[PDB]
Amino acid sequence: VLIFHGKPVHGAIFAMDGTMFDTERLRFQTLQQASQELIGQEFSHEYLMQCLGLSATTAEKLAQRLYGVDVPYKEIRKRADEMELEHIRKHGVPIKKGLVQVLERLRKSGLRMAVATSSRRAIAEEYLINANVYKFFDVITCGDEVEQGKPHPEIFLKAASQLHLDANQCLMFEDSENGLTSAHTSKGLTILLKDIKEPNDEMLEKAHFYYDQMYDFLTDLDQFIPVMDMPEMQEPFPQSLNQLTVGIHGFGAIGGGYIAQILSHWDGYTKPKRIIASTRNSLFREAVNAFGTYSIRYGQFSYDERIENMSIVDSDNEQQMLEMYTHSSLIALCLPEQAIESESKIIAKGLYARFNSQLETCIEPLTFLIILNKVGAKYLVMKHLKEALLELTNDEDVTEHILKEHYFCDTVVNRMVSKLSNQNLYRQLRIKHNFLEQHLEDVEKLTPDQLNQASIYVDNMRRNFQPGHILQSMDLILFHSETDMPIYVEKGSPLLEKLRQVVLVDQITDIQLIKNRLWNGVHAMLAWYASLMGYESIGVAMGDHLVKAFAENLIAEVKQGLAIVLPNYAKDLDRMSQSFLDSCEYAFKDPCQRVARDPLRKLNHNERVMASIAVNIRHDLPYKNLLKGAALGYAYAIQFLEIEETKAVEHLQQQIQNLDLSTAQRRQLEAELVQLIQYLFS
Amino acid sequence: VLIFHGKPVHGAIFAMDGTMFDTERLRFQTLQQASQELIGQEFSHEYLMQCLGLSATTAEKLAQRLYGVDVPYKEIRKRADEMELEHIRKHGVPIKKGLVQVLERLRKSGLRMAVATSSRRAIAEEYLINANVYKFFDVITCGDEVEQGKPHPEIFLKAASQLHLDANQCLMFEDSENGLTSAHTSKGLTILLKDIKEPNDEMLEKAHFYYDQMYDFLTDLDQFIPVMDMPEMQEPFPQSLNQLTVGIHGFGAIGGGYIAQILSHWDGYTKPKRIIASTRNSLFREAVNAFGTYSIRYGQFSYDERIENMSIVDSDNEQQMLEMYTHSSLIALCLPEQAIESESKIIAKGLYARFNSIEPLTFLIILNKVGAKYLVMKHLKEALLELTNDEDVTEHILKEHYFCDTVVNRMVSKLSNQNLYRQLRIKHNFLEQHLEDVQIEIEDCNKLTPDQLNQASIYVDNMRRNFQPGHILQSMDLILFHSETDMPIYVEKGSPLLEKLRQVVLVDQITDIQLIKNRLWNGVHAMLAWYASLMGYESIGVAMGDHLVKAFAENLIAEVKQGLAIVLPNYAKDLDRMSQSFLDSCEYAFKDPCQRVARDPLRKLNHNERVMASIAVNIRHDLPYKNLLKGAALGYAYAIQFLEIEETKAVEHLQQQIQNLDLSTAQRRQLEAELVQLIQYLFSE
Numbered sequence A: 001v002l003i004f005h006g007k008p009v010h011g012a013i014f015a016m017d018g019t020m021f022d023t024e025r026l027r028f029q030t031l032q033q034a035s036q037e038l039i040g041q042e043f044s045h046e047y048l049m050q051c052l053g054l055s056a057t058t059a060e061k062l063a064q065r066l067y068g069v070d071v072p073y074k075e076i077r078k079r080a081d082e083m084e085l086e087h088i089r090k091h092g093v094p095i096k097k098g099l100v101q102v103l104e105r106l107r108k109s110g111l112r113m114a115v116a117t118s119s120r121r122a123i124a125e126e127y128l129i130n131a132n133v134y135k136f137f138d139v140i141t142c143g144d145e146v147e148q149g150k151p152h153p154e155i156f157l158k159a160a161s162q163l164h165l166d167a168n169q170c171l172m173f174e175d176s177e178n179g180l181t182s183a184h185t186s187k188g189l190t191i192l193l194k195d196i197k198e199p200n201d202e203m204l205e206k207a208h209f210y211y212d213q214m215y216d217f218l219t220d221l222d223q224f225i226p227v228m229d230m231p232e233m234q235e236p237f238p239q240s241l242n243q244l245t246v247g248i249h250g251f252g253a254i255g256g257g258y259i260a261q262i263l264s265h266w267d268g269y270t271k272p273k274r275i276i277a278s279t280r281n282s283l284f285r286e287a288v289n290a291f292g293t294y295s296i297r298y299g300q301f302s303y304d305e306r307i308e309n310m311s312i313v314d315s316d317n318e319q320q321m322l323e324m325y326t327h328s329s330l331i332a333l334c335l336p337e338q339a340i341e342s343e344s345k346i347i348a349k350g351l352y353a354r355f356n357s358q359l360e361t362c363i364e365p366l367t368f369l370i371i372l373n374k375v376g377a378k379y380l381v382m383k384h385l386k387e388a389l390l391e392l393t394n395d396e397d398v399t400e401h402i403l404k405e406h407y408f409c410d411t412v413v414n415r416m417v418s419k420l421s422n423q424n425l426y427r428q429l430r431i432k433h434n435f436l437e438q439h440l441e442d443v444e445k446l447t448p449d450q451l452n453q454a455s456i457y458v459d460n461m462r463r464n465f466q467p468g469h470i471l472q473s474m475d476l477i478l479f480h481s482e483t484d485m486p487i488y489v490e491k492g493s494p495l496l497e498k499l500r501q502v503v504l505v506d507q508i509t510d511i512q513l514i515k516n517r518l519w520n521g522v523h524a525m526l527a528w529y530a531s532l533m534g535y536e537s538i539g540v541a542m543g544d545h546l547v548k549a550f551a552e553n554l555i556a557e558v559k560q561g562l563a564i565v566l567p568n569y570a571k572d573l574d575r576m577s578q579s580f581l582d583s584c585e586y587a588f589k590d591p592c593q594r595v596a597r598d599p600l601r602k603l604n605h606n607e608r609v610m611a612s613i614a615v616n617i618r619h620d621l622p623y624k625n626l627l628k629g630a631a632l633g634y635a636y637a638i639q640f641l642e643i644e645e646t647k648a649v650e651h652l653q654q655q656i657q658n659l660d661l662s663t664a665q666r667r668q669l670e671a672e673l674v675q676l677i678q679y680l681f682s
Numbered sequence B: 001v002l003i004f005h006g007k008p009v010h011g012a013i014f015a016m017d018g019t020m021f022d023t024e025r026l027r028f029q030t031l032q033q034a035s036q037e038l039i040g041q042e043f044s045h046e047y048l049m050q051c052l053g054l055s056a057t058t059a060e061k062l063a064q065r066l067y068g069v070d071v072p073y074k075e076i077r078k079r080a081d082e083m084e085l086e087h088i089r090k091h092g093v094p095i096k097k098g099l100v101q102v103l104e105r106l107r108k109s110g111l112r113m114a115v116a117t118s119s120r121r122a123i124a125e126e127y128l129i130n131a132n133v134y135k136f137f138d139v140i141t142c143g144d145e146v147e148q149g150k151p152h153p154e155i156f157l158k159a160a161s162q163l164h165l166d167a168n169q170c171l172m173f174e175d176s177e178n179g180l181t182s183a184h185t186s187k188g189l190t191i192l193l194k195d196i197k198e199p200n201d202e203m204l205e206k207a208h209f210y211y212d213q214m215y216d217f218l219t220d221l222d223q224f225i226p227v228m229d230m231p232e233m234q235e236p237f238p239q240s241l242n243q244l245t246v247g248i249h250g251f252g253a254i255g256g257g258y259i260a261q262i263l264s265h266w267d268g269y270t271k272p273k274r275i276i277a278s279t280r281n282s283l284f285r286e287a288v289n290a291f292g293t294y295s296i297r298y299g300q301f302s303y304d305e306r307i308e309n310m311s312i313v314d315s316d317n318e319q320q321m322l323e324m325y326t327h328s329s330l331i332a333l334c335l336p337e338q339a340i341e342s343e344s345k346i347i348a349k350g351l352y353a354r355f356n357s358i359e360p361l362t363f364l365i366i367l368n369k370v371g372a373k374y375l376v377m378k379h380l381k382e383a384l385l386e387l388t389n390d391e392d393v394t395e396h397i398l399k400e401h402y403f404c405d406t407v408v409n410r411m412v413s414k415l416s417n418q419n420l421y422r423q424l425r426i427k428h429n430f431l432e433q434h435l436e437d438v439q440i441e442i443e444d445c446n447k448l449t450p451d452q453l454n455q456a457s458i459y460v461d462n463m464r465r466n467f468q469p470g471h472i473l474q475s476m477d478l479i480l481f482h483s484e485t486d487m488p489i490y491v492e493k494g495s496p497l498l499e500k501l502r503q504v505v506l507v508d509q510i511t512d513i514q515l516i517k518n519r520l521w522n523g524v525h526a527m528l529a530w531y532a533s534l535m536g537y538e539s540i541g542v543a544m545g546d547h548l549v550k551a552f553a554e555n556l557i558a559e560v561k562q563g564l565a566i567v568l569p570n571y572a573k574d575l576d577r578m579s580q581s582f583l584d585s586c587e588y589a590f591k592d593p594c595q596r597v598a599r600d601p602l603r604k605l606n607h608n609e610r611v612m613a614s615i616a617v618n619i620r621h622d623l624p625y626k627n628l629l630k631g632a633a634l635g636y637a638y639a640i641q642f643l644e645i646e647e648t649k650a651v652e653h654l655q656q657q658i659q660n661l662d663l664s665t666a667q668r669r670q671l672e673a674e675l676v677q678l679i680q681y682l683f684s685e
């Protein structure tokens, strides 16, 4: 049962104009233009304000009081409605920000829903179908269907009666003083949203709850509806689109093959209407924009996940990058460490444009996710961003205001993704182009007035849509990824509170430590073992029984010490361990060289190998596989990276001396480690 | 792990040419043509038969012995491969029937899968991408990557090693003599499929399992493959398309708004590549054919379910209707009672053309009637006699095909033509505005030659101009039906095709689910209509607003459910789900009037009908029947007041039905007094 502010709610009834849609402001202009053309004067602001919530019949009676019994209101209204339907035909129904997010929350909560509007059925059905919100309502009650319109309670009492609920079990959404009175008298749980009239004390008194805008009600409603569970593999994305735009700065492997799935799942109720991703790969950009979508292939389940509403922009195109930072609510920076410095100038330009623009998107702060498998990624990005903003604005006050306005969130990503090579994309485009060519070979009770009009609609639609019919079973595969779902994100941004694929953490350091030791540690040691055994990738190495056994034992050893050091992360350790082993199995596009790089840095006392050894020695847990991994590291540095034996031993003795162990444990470790290194050289 | 005939398998390694695809017959023709051109003569049939399973390098050595050390086999093979790739680019890769159905079952069973082919890597990857099967394999092993090709086991050993499995844990699929020897020598669990060569005694002995075609293995695998659970609301359809075609004879509310979802879910592993639906509504027909798809709207969850691969044909088009009966595997007849007479002539023409041109057709009867199969088979057999004039052929057609009546609980409403016109007008305007918002030159891309970039620019430009107008279809649905969320269809057991369909519930006897439909669905519906009419309401949905009518429906559905659980305890789980589904569908049934449902009260008040039979069952099993007794009293009150049935004539019927009920003399006299008192109490109000 949906509980809202202590009250059990079973239904929700909405006023349409001014509450769901921003159509009262447009109607003010059409009625003013139609009255100017017919009675030589515009309808006053006072008359049009008094009309809010009234049906065309009651608004006609009000026009006869102020302008005279012979006022041609029916002719003025008819002309205004025609101009209004023409504006809606050219630009669409202006939907109040957050409406579909609210509707999907109430629908998924099991509420019976209705519209109670003073507008006539024809206009109401036009706007509800045009805005694609008609599907959310069981009942529609209109102004031309009630004897006593607003402020009389009849229309709300009738909508509640048609939903088979008492008015007091219904939330009633209103914007006008007349409408609010109708809903309040009916006995509904009134929710007043500000539209044109600044609510007076009488409106604020009878309203059960008041919000300045639909988004503010959405924020309150979120406290009464749950955060959806972590998505499963193959679970579909939400159908409904909200009005938000999200951005992926860097359409590489993790951005396209992972962040896009996170952003497409959004909160489970709705998903962004547009995802802007930036890349310098022209082939990738043009391919996505030709299809409108791309797909992520998950080899394990042979499942192609389609990422809809994608828009790929050129990274070097200043105007497209400004649009991403000006229209987006969330931006995920998915750049390599090498690109941070040069890209910070583009991030600065976009954040400065967001600061200067007067749009209704730049008012809310931006949530900036920093996606980088490096400890201190947030600090590296923030330092470069501050430098770039300072030289661009040449104003310390503007720079500080920008860096304090937004939520810069550090993250822990575990999913392994591989971006398709340009040669493989080219081959895919060549094969699917021939399919498109073959598809083009195969395809080559109404009045007569509207039956001929329908023939034009259907012909124009068949001509434009037919070539794209092949997209029903044709995907643009761009990424091959693993099945790891959760992204660990720093808590703080309120925009992250409902994202179902995000795991919020108060401090990111604990899951960063787990990532470093359990994931990166076992990965670097597995790469050193595989490099010395002659394998060029982890996936090929996993074919060797001794390599697969080493990986299973090495992760079981690290996890054992981590379960004691961080018992609050016990389930995460079990999940990440199996995730690592599953992702290592067929990792053919994961070369050993990149994973085994910088072995002396990875063999430091506080790094991914020696720190786990010290923990297992301090808690009397086995460490033979961890010792073998450390020995493989020093052997790899000497045999492959040409590091002198004298420097490897000097580094070995320095890190062991830095470890928090007894003198006996340090000596035993040093002797066992040097013994294994000498044994490897045979 | 997968238990296939007792054998535990962790992997599945497949040969490509001849096993997965029918490319050995095409390669035979291209090699005959290429040799004819370059050496003046066609390669002998014996040389090409010996080449089956061999790599291009091994086939070259064999050609040097039989034709001379200086034969241009490399030139002939390159020329034959180019003619084959041209044929494959046009017609597509010819997939062996059932391949994707097999791959998806092995993949969902958690098997590690690989391809071990004597074909060149560039040819193999191209064919697997083309046929959309590449995604089913973790690793591919090709003929140009081993030192010794088939019949040497190296390639099947390497495919198992790269899968990280022992060869004796992998099912190995083969078709040729050379390929089978490579698989058998590797120690894998060999499965032989018949391709070009007739399997000799040496091959039949080597093979652990033998099948004449890929579809035979699919039927054998289905014995060890678990059937998928009943689909849930909003659960997506399978991504993989099989090669089957299905048909819906009658694209109305039940055909388009229900059967299409069952056919789209299919078995959960794959779904038919094409669903042909017939209709006389040219506005509906041309709309689906313009969009490519249509959607079913489920108001309860505000969910639009898109139905893909639909092909709407004209019911009067003889050619299109004949094509539906010859290409389809399953056909659902979704036409009303009145159309049966005229449409039976079209079904007769289609079924006659099917046996003139292989597998038995599974025909589903989708019509609301206990014995609707009789009406269809009566007019169908009469149409076959006046068209074929042969009783011996007519008897063979009706005996081979799987004709089966069904029980449908879902209520669906077809969109009106006026509402469809408004929708077309609003969506056309969206397309028109989208076209106002909307050549490509790709450069500076690494690892691609300047000519490859120019060629990619052409492909992508052609794709952009063709797909761009249809980009709006990602969030634009062609809503044609408004449907309830009732999922299971009850079908007569018999057809083996219906054994794996996840949305189909097979029954031992259809009489049992027809009786449940009569007492639980039609029974409570009639008793609700009688109550609503006497209360003053003229609609079922309007009556649900009255709290006493809603509680009466919940109390009626509970008393009938308890009784039906004693008589038919096999449908205990079905009864509880059908009860809630009935209440959810009655809630907003404003479209359905009360006069239609409350029609003929005395016939529905018979001892064996939807009211008294439930009362007698409850009395005999000491279950409560107070609301069922009120429902019977409302039926007589409605007949007396609304239908001008004499009060004495209603009491005589009341006494006769109670006497026909299997109850004791004491229970009959108690029921009669209880019923008469309730009828007199209704007149007092």
Ligand SMILES: O=P(O)(O)OC[C@@H](O)[C@@H](O)[C@H](O)[C@H](O)CO
Residues within 6 Å of the ligand: A015, A016, A017, A018, A019, A024, A027, A031, A048, A051, A052, A053, A054, A055, A056, A059, A116, A117, A118, A119, A176, A179
């Ligand atoms: O009950 P609603 O808020 O859905 O719609 C009321 C409008 O029709 C009404 O406010 C008119 O726009 C107004 O009366 C015209 O001046």
Ligand SMILES: O=P(O)(O)OC[C@@H](O)[C@@H](O)[C@H](O)[C@H](O)CO
Residues within 6 Å of the ligand: B015, B016, B017, B018, B019, B024, B027, B031, B048, B051, B052, B053, B054, B055, B056, B059, B116, B117, B118, B119, B120, B176, B179
């Ligand atoms: O191992 P497969 O069955 O996937 O492929 C074998 C073919 O490459 C081979 O049979 C050629 O078609 C043959 O060598 C041409 O004459």
Ligand SMILES: [Cl-]
Residues within 6 Å of the ligand: A097, A098, A099, A100, A101, A242, A243, A244
């Ligand atoms: Cl929104």
Ligand SMILES: [Cl-]
Residues within 6 Å of the ligand: A354, A355, A401, A402, A405
């Ligand atoms: Cl700002």
Ligand SMILES: [Cl-]
Residues within 6 Å of the ligand: none
């Ligand atoms: Cl200041």
Ligand SMILES: [Mg+2]
Residues within 6 Å of the ligand: A370, A371, A372, A373, A374, A377, A378, A410, A411, A412
């Ligand atoms: Mg990070």
